[PDB]
Design a protein around this nucleic acid. Sequence first.
RNA 1: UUGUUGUUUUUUUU
Lengths: 278, 278
Amino acid sequence: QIKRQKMIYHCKFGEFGVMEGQFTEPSGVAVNAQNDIIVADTNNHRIQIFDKEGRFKFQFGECGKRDSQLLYPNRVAVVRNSGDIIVTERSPTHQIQIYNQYGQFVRKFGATILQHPRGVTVDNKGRIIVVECKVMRVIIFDQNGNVLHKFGCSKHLEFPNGVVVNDKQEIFISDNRAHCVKVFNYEGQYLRQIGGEGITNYPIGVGINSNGEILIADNHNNFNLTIFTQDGQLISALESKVKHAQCFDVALMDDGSVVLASKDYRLYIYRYVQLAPV
Amino acid sequence: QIKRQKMIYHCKFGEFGVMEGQFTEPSGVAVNAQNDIIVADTNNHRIQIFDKEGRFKFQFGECGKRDQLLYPNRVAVVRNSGDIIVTERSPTHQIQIYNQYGQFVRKFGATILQHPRGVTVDNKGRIIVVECKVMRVIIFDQNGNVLHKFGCSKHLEFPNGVVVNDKQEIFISDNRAHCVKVFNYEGQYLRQIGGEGITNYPIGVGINSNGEILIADNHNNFNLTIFTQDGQLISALESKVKHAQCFDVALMDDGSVVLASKDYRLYIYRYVQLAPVG
RNA sequence: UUGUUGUUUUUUUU
């Protein structure tokens, strides 16, 4: 029922492979303060960092369980102020790893606590928030590995696959099978719903931009971006001109863009802002 | 243990999508007398035809069970007529014949074929299908009559490709036997080409204008190993970059292999070269 | 509709 603004990507990079700028599986994507694009390249067991234009800068990590090694890294997040890179690993490892902006290993934790990490983010106080699929848990860490909060949401979540937070201790979780974003507080109380069936079907990720606006991305037919206020009011809706392979994850860039990681081993950058027409 | 000549592809085309020159799943590839590249685009329920340089010419077929395609997975060309032989995988599991213009001619074999996994045509116009799981070879005439039929569960573990010479010898690539197995039309096992160490996990087989046997695999890099029909090794190549899972391969008379891959792209590798100056 | 492999892992839907 919504007439969506058409959009095309202005940037595309990546391909299959093990060399620099190549992926085996780009399961996770994140963006730092300088709009560098950080990608979890799972089956290469490494993290790759690109600039905002998709040029390879550097990589870190290799297959293993030792320090400075990764085993199936799937999601990434950035500590804004320090530029530290938060990495989650999939089961059987299911733990958090922290690397600094130079790709040096800092620490790892949460291995005995996490089961199926599926989304990760960091609030303005540096607390690390992980959402887990299947078991439907949310776990909040500090950067040294202490558990600050923990709660289940198996009552409200069917398939959680993305998470962000505002500065009011509200957690926005995209739910693939509920066709919407679910909002919680740090205590674990369900607050409200953003989007829903018919406008945000099968969401694959969620973002919060510098305006505090909530972006919900999905690939239900074309690639769609639906933008809301935190109270749930729709303010913008976009749709891609071409169809995309399965989408793993999305991240926001300060220029008003979404970085899209897809199963065709490529990343796409869509602009969701435009000039005001005369 | 074999020192392989390194190679790079000189042509690349295709991407994910439903439009012309886009694929959802390029499961099958074939080449006609004019080196047009014919692609089975399975989940789009269509066949797409490109010229030797990867330019889109035209498409035919749409989803359905009427005299339409439902999950076409392999293709072969009747050289003299330019007819396109199409197999559909289960549940349909039948052969369809289209002419060079993409016009439906006829369909057959629905009640006999179970799991078509490879198809080719001999110089007399007989259509040969190899089936995985059940390990069968079935030879049809162009009206749909079964001329020959035999099981090879004793010699085959995972057949995924087939070609023939003009001597009624059938060359079948076996993914889990790491070689090509040779049979006659009666079903007698004749000999083996390749083996463990040089043709691991073959994904297809070809016979070129010289009667030379090409075995393609993606066990690490993309490899081409070339033999005589008696099994003597004469050439061996390997790609400089790694590829996503490869569905199928076909030969171009200019001395190239067309490679269809799970990254929704086709690659053309040249396996001939200039003689260096001595 | 789908048996490639390329270290275990990966509930998107189309």
